[PDB]
Design a protein around this ligand. Structure first.
Ligand code: HEC
Ligand code: HEC
Lengths: 126, 126
Protein backbone atom coordinates (compact mmCIF):
# COMPACT_ATOMS: atom_id res chain seq x y z
CA UNK A 1 0.00 0.00 0.00
CA UNK A 2 3.07 2.29 -0.08
CA UNK A 3 4.09 4.28 -3.13
CA UNK A 4 7.68 4.74 -1.93
CA UNK A 5 9.73 3.35 0.93
CA UNK A 6 9.32 6.64 2.82
CA UNK A 7 5.57 5.97 2.95
CA UNK A 8 6.18 2.61 4.70
CA UNK A 9 8.48 4.34 7.16
CA UNK A 10 5.92 6.97 8.00
CA UNK A 11 3.20 4.31 8.40
CA UNK A 12 5.17 2.13 10.75
CA UNK A 13 6.33 5.08 12.85
CA UNK A 14 2.75 6.23 13.21
CA UNK A 15 1.55 2.74 14.08
CA UNK A 16 4.28 2.34 16.69
CA UNK A 17 3.50 5.79 18.15
CA UNK A 18 -0.18 4.87 18.54
CA UNK A 19 0.36 1.39 19.65
CA UNK A 20 2.77 2.88 22.24
CA UNK A 21 0.32 5.46 23.66
CA UNK A 22 -2.25 2.67 24.15
CA UNK A 23 0.29 0.60 26.05
CA UNK A 24 1.87 3.35 28.11
CA UNK A 25 -1.38 5.03 29.17
CA UNK A 26 -2.02 1.93 31.33
CA UNK A 27 1.10 2.36 33.40
CA UNK A 28 -0.59 4.39 36.18
CA UNK A 29 -3.32 1.77 36.43
CA UNK A 30 -0.81 -1.13 36.66
CA UNK A 31 1.04 0.84 39.34
CA UNK A 32 -2.13 1.62 41.36
CA UNK A 33 -1.69 5.38 40.91
CA UNK A 34 -4.94 5.49 38.91
CA UNK A 35 -8.06 3.49 39.56
CA UNK A 36 -8.71 0.17 37.88
CA UNK A 37 -11.88 0.05 35.77
CA UNK A 38 -12.00 -3.43 34.23
CA UNK A 39 -14.24 -2.40 31.34
CA UNK A 40 -12.09 0.64 30.50
CA UNK A 41 -8.95 -1.51 30.39
CA UNK A 42 -10.66 -4.28 28.39
CA UNK A 43 -11.65 -1.73 25.76
CA UNK A 44 -8.21 -0.17 25.64
CA UNK A 45 -6.48 -3.54 25.32
CA UNK A 46 -8.77 -4.35 22.40
CA UNK A 47 -7.49 -1.20 20.64
CA UNK A 48 -3.94 -2.15 21.50
CA UNK A 49 -4.50 -5.61 20.05
CA UNK A 50 -5.56 -4.19 16.74
CA UNK A 51 -2.68 -1.70 16.66
CA UNK A 52 -0.13 -4.25 17.69
CA UNK A 53 -0.64 -6.23 14.46
CA UNK A 54 -0.08 -3.25 12.14
CA UNK A 55 3.58 -2.23 12.11
CA UNK A 56 5.15 -5.43 10.73
CA UNK A 57 3.79 -5.41 7.21
CA UNK A 58 5.33 -1.96 6.78
CA UNK A 59 8.80 -3.47 7.06
CA UNK A 60 8.38 -5.09 3.61
CA UNK A 61 11.14 -5.63 1.08
CA UNK A 62 12.61 -2.30 -0.10
CA UNK A 63 11.17 -0.35 2.88
CA UNK A 64 14.58 0.39 4.48
CA UNK A 65 14.83 3.76 6.43
CA UNK A 66 13.83 5.54 9.60
CA UNK A 67 15.37 4.06 12.72
CA UNK A 68 15.01 0.45 11.45
CA UNK A 69 18.37 -1.29 11.81
CA UNK A 70 19.43 -3.05 8.60
CA UNK A 71 19.43 -6.27 10.59
CA UNK A 72 15.60 -6.39 10.28
CA UNK A 73 15.65 -7.72 6.59
CA UNK A 74 18.88 -9.80 6.55
CA UNK A 75 17.71 -11.77 9.56
CA UNK A 76 14.02 -12.06 8.63
CA UNK A 77 13.13 -15.26 10.54
CA UNK A 78 14.54 -13.87 13.73
CA UNK A 79 12.84 -10.48 13.30
CA UNK A 80 9.77 -12.49 12.92
CA UNK A 81 10.41 -14.40 16.17
CA UNK A 82 10.61 -11.08 18.08
CA UNK A 83 7.40 -9.81 16.47
CA UNK A 84 5.46 -13.05 17.03
CA UNK A 85 6.63 -13.29 20.69
CA UNK A 86 5.47 -9.74 21.24
CA UNK A 87 2.01 -10.46 19.81
CA UNK A 88 1.78 -13.69 21.79
CA UNK A 89 2.54 -11.54 24.85
CA UNK A 90 -0.34 -9.18 23.62
CA UNK A 91 -2.68 -12.26 23.52
CA UNK A 92 -1.88 -12.87 27.15
CA UNK A 93 -2.55 -9.22 28.00
CA UNK A 94 -5.91 -9.47 26.27
CA UNK A 95 -6.73 -12.58 28.29
CA UNK A 96 -5.88 -10.79 31.54
CA UNK A 97 -7.94 -7.70 30.55
CA UNK A 98 -10.91 -9.78 29.36
CA UNK A 99 -10.87 -11.70 32.64
CA UNK A 100 -10.84 -8.45 34.68
CA UNK A 101 -7.89 -9.39 36.93
CA UNK A 102 -5.44 -6.60 38.06
CA UNK A 103 -2.76 -9.08 39.23
CA UNK A 104 -2.76 -10.95 35.94
CA UNK A 105 -2.85 -7.61 34.07
CA UNK A 106 0.24 -6.38 35.89
CA UNK A 107 2.19 -9.52 35.12
CA UNK A 108 1.09 -9.58 31.47
CA UNK A 109 1.87 -5.85 31.10
CA UNK A 110 5.40 -6.51 32.34
CA UNK A 111 5.84 -9.29 29.82
CA UNK A 112 4.71 -7.12 26.97
CA UNK A 113 7.05 -4.33 28.03
CA UNK A 114 10.00 -6.75 28.10
CA UNK A 115 9.12 -7.87 24.53
CA UNK A 116 9.05 -4.23 23.33
CA UNK A 117 12.49 -3.68 24.86
CA UNK A 118 13.92 -6.89 23.40
CA UNK A 119 13.03 -5.88 19.86
CA UNK A 120 14.20 -2.32 20.50
CA UNK A 121 17.62 -3.44 21.69
CA UNK A 122 18.17 -5.69 18.65
CA UNK A 123 16.47 -3.87 15.76
CA UNK A 124 16.05 -0.15 16.42
CA UNK A 125 18.90 2.22 15.65
CA UNK A 126 20.38 4.31 18.43
CA UNK B 1 -3.27 10.16 28.32
CA UNK B 2 -1.12 13.10 27.13
CA UNK B 3 1.51 14.75 29.30
CA UNK B 4 1.57 17.93 27.21
CA UNK B 5 -0.52 19.30 24.36
CA UNK B 6 2.25 18.36 21.89
CA UNK B 7 1.67 14.70 22.82
CA UNK B 8 -2.02 14.98 21.82
CA UNK B 9 -0.99 16.58 18.54
CA UNK B 10 1.44 13.82 17.74
CA UNK B 11 -1.16 11.16 18.63
CA UNK B 12 -3.89 12.58 16.46
CA UNK B 13 -1.55 13.13 13.52
CA UNK B 14 -0.42 9.52 13.75
CA UNK B 15 -3.98 8.26 14.04
CA UNK B 16 -5.06 10.30 11.03
CA UNK B 17 -2.04 9.10 9.02
CA UNK B 18 -2.92 5.46 9.74
CA UNK B 19 -6.57 5.83 9.39
CA UNK B 20 -5.81 7.51 6.03
CA UNK B 21 -3.56 4.72 4.66
CA UNK B 22 -6.32 2.19 5.47
CA UNK B 23 -8.85 4.26 3.56
CA UNK B 24 -6.71 5.23 0.60
CA UNK B 25 -5.24 1.77 -0.03
CA UNK B 26 -8.74 0.73 -1.18
CA UNK B 27 -8.90 3.27 -3.97
CA UNK B 28 -7.54 0.90 -6.67
CA UNK B 29 -10.06 -1.73 -5.64
CA UNK B 30 -13.00 0.73 -5.76
CA UNK B 31 -11.79 1.84 -9.20
CA UNK B 32 -11.41 -1.74 -10.53
CA UNK B 33 -7.67 -1.31 -11.10
CA UNK B 34 -6.99 -4.00 -8.48
CA UNK B 35 -9.00 -7.12 -7.88
CA UNK B 36 -11.80 -7.27 -5.35
CA UNK B 37 -11.33 -9.84 -2.59
CA UNK B 38 -14.34 -9.49 -0.29
CA UNK B 39 -12.59 -11.01 2.72
CA UNK B 40 -9.50 -8.81 2.29
CA UNK B 41 -11.66 -5.68 2.16
CA UNK B 42 -13.82 -6.79 5.10
CA UNK B 43 -10.70 -7.20 7.22
CA UNK B 44 -9.25 -3.87 6.14
CA UNK B 45 -12.50 -2.02 6.83
CA UNK B 46 -12.53 -3.53 10.31
CA UNK B 47 -9.09 -1.97 10.92
CA UNK B 48 -10.33 1.31 9.50
CA UNK B 49 -13.32 1.20 11.82
CA UNK B 50 -11.13 0.92 14.86
CA UNK B 51 -8.78 3.67 13.65
CA UNK B 52 -11.58 5.97 12.69
CA UNK B 53 -12.72 6.30 16.32
CA UNK B 54 -9.29 7.31 17.66
CA UNK B 55 -8.40 10.84 16.59
CA UNK B 56 -11.23 12.78 18.28
CA UNK B 57 -10.33 12.29 21.92
CA UNK B 58 -6.93 13.79 21.14
CA UNK B 59 -8.56 17.14 20.41
CA UNK B 60 -9.31 17.59 24.15
CA UNK B 61 -9.31 20.88 26.00
CA UNK B 62 -5.84 22.50 25.98
CA UNK B 63 -4.61 20.34 23.06
CA UNK B 64 -4.37 23.25 20.56
CA UNK B 65 -1.56 22.93 17.87
CA UNK B 66 -0.56 21.16 14.69
CA UNK B 67 -2.78 21.96 11.74
CA UNK B 68 -5.97 22.02 13.88
CA UNK B 69 -7.85 25.24 13.15
CA UNK B 70 -8.83 27.08 16.35
CA UNK B 71 -12.43 26.70 15.24
CA UNK B 72 -12.36 23.06 16.46
CA UNK B 73 -12.77 24.03 20.24
CA UNK B 74 -14.88 27.23 20.01
CA UNK B 75 -17.47 25.43 17.91
CA UNK B 76 -17.43 22.08 19.73
CA UNK B 77 -20.96 20.85 18.90
CA UNK B 78 -20.41 21.43 15.23
CA UNK B 79 -16.97 19.79 15.23
CA UNK B 80 -18.74 16.95 16.79
CA UNK B 81 -21.38 16.86 14.03
CA UNK B 82 -18.61 16.51 11.40
CA UNK B 83 -16.90 13.73 13.37
CA UNK B 84 -20.12 11.80 14.07
CA UNK B 85 -21.26 12.08 10.40
CA UNK B 86 -17.91 10.73 9.32
CA UNK B 87 -18.17 7.72 11.65
CA UNK B 88 -21.76 7.13 10.61
CA UNK B 89 -20.43 7.07 7.03
CA UNK B 90 -17.76 4.50 8.32
CA UNK B 91 -20.66 2.35 9.69
CA UNK B 92 -22.13 2.28 6.22
CA UNK B 93 -18.77 1.33 4.72
CA UNK B 94 -18.50 -1.52 7.20
CA UNK B 95 -21.98 -2.71 6.23
CA UNK B 96 -21.03 -2.70 2.55
CA UNK B 97 -17.73 -4.56 3.23
CA UNK B 98 -19.39 -7.10 5.55
CA UNK B 99 -22.03 -7.78 2.90
CA UNK B 100 -19.36 -8.33 0.20
CA UNK B 101 -20.88 -5.97 -2.39
CA UNK B 102 -18.52 -3.94 -4.70
CA UNK B 103 -21.28 -1.54 -5.85
CA UNK B 104 -22.32 -0.71 -2.31
CA UNK B 105 -18.63 -0.45 -1.31
CA UNK B 106 -17.96 2.08 -4.05
CA UNK B 107 -20.88 4.25 -3.04
CA UNK B 108 -20.04 4.05 0.67
CA UNK B 109 -16.36 4.79 -0.05
CA UNK B 110 -17.39 7.94 -1.89
CA UNK B 111 -19.51 9.05 1.03
CA UNK B 112 -16.69 8.56 3.48
CA UNK B 113 -14.30 10.50 1.26
CA UNK B 114 -16.76 13.42 1.08
CA UNK B 115 -16.97 13.44 4.91
CA UNK B 116 -13.15 13.55 5.19
CA UNK B 117 -13.08 16.51 2.81
CA UNK B 118 -15.90 18.34 4.61
CA UNK B 119 -14.05 18.29 7.92
CA UNK B 120 -10.78 19.17 6.20
CA UNK B 121 -12.25 22.24 4.53
CA UNK B 122 -13.72 23.56 7.80
CA UNK B 123 -11.23 22.54 10.50
CA UNK B 124 -7.76 21.86 9.09
CA UNK B 125 -5.36 24.76 8.59
CA UNK B 126 -4.03 25.47 5.12
C1 HEC C 1 10.19 -5.52 16.89
C2 HEC C 1 9.49 -6.85 16.67
C3 HEC C 1 9.47 -4.48 17.73
C4 HEC C 1 8.59 -4.60 18.75
C5 HEC C 1 7.99 -5.84 19.37
C6 HEC C 1 8.27 -3.27 19.21
N1 HEC C 1 8.96 -2.32 18.47
FE1 HEC C 1 9.05 -0.33 18.81
N2 HEC C 1 10.11 -0.10 17.08
C7 HEC C 1 10.70 -1.14 16.36
C8 HEC C 1 11.49 -0.60 15.25
C9 HEC C 1 12.27 -1.41 14.28
C10 HEC C 1 11.32 0.79 15.36
C11 HEC C 1 11.85 1.79 14.35
C12 HEC C 1 10.90 2.05 13.20
C13 HEC C 1 11.41 3.03 12.16
O1 HEC C 1 11.42 2.67 10.96
O2 HEC C 1 11.84 4.16 12.55
C14 HEC C 1 10.51 1.08 16.49
C15 HEC C 1 10.10 2.31 16.89
C16 HEC C 1 9.29 2.59 17.96
C17 HEC C 1 8.84 3.88 18.39
C18 HEC C 1 9.14 5.18 17.65
C19 HEC C 1 8.20 5.44 16.49
C20 HEC C 1 8.41 6.78 15.78
O3 HEC C 1 7.50 7.59 15.91
O4 HEC C 1 9.39 6.97 15.04
C21 HEC C 1 8.08 3.74 19.47
C22 HEC C 1 7.35 4.82 20.25
C23 HEC C 1 8.05 2.32 19.80
N3 HEC C 1 8.78 1.64 18.84
C24 HEC C 1 7.39 1.79 20.89
C25 HEC C 1 7.20 0.45 21.11
C26 HEC C 1 6.41 -0.15 22.15
C27 HEC C 1 5.81 0.67 23.29
C28 HEC C 1 6.42 -1.46 21.97
C29 HEC C 1 5.70 -2.55 22.78
C30 HEC C 1 4.27 -2.14 23.19
C31 HEC C 1 7.21 -1.73 20.80
N4 HEC C 1 7.66 -0.53 20.28
C32 HEC C 1 7.45 -2.97 20.27
C33 HEC C 1 10.56 -2.48 16.64
C34 HEC C 1 9.72 -3.06 17.57
C1 HEC D 1 -12.92 16.22 11.30
C2 HEC D 1 -14.13 15.63 11.99
C3 HEC D 1 -12.08 15.29 10.43
C4 HEC D 1 -12.41 14.20 9.71
C5 HEC D 1 -13.75 13.50 9.56
C6 HEC D 1 -11.23 13.74 9.04
N1 HEC D 1 -10.14 14.56 9.35
FE1 HEC D 1 -8.29 14.51 8.54
N2 HEC D 1 -7.69 15.95 9.86
C7 HEC D 1 -8.55 16.72 10.65
C8 HEC D 1 -7.79 17.72 11.37
C9 HEC D 1 -8.37 18.74 12.30
C10 HEC D 1 -6.45 17.50 10.99
C11 HEC D 1 -5.26 18.23 11.58
C12 HEC D 1 -4.71 17.56 12.82
C13 HEC D 1 -3.53 18.28 13.45
O1 HEC D 1 -3.60 18.58 14.67
O2 HEC D 1 -2.54 18.57 12.71
C14 HEC D 1 -6.42 16.43 10.04
C15 HEC D 1 -5.31 15.91 9.48
C16 HEC D 1 -5.27 14.86 8.59
C17 HEC D 1 -4.10 14.28 7.99
C18 HEC D 1 -2.67 14.72 8.30
C19 HEC D 1 -2.12 14.07 9.56
C20 HEC D 1 -0.66 14.40 9.86
O3 HEC D 1 0.13 13.46 9.76
O4 HEC D 1 -0.32 15.53 10.28
C21 HEC D 1 -4.47 13.30 7.18
C22 HEC D 1 -3.59 12.37 6.36
C23 HEC D 1 -5.92 13.23 7.21
N3 HEC D 1 -6.39 14.18 8.10
C24 HEC D 1 -6.68 12.34 6.47
C25 HEC D 1 -8.03 12.15 6.62
C26 HEC D 1 -8.83 11.15 5.97
C27 HEC D 1 -8.29 10.27 4.84
C28 HEC D 1 -10.07 11.24 6.45
C29 HEC D 1 -11.29 10.38 6.11
C30 HEC D 1 -10.95 8.89 5.97
C31 HEC D 1 -10.07 12.29 7.43
N4 HEC D 1 -8.80 12.82 7.52
C32 HEC D 1 -11.16 12.69 8.16
C33 HEC D 1 -9.91 16.55 10.74
C34 HEC D 1 -10.67 15.53 10.20
Amino acid sequence: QFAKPEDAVKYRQSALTLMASHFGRMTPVVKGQAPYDAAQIKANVEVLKTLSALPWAAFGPGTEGGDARPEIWSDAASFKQKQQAFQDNIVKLSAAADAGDLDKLRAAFGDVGASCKACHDAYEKK
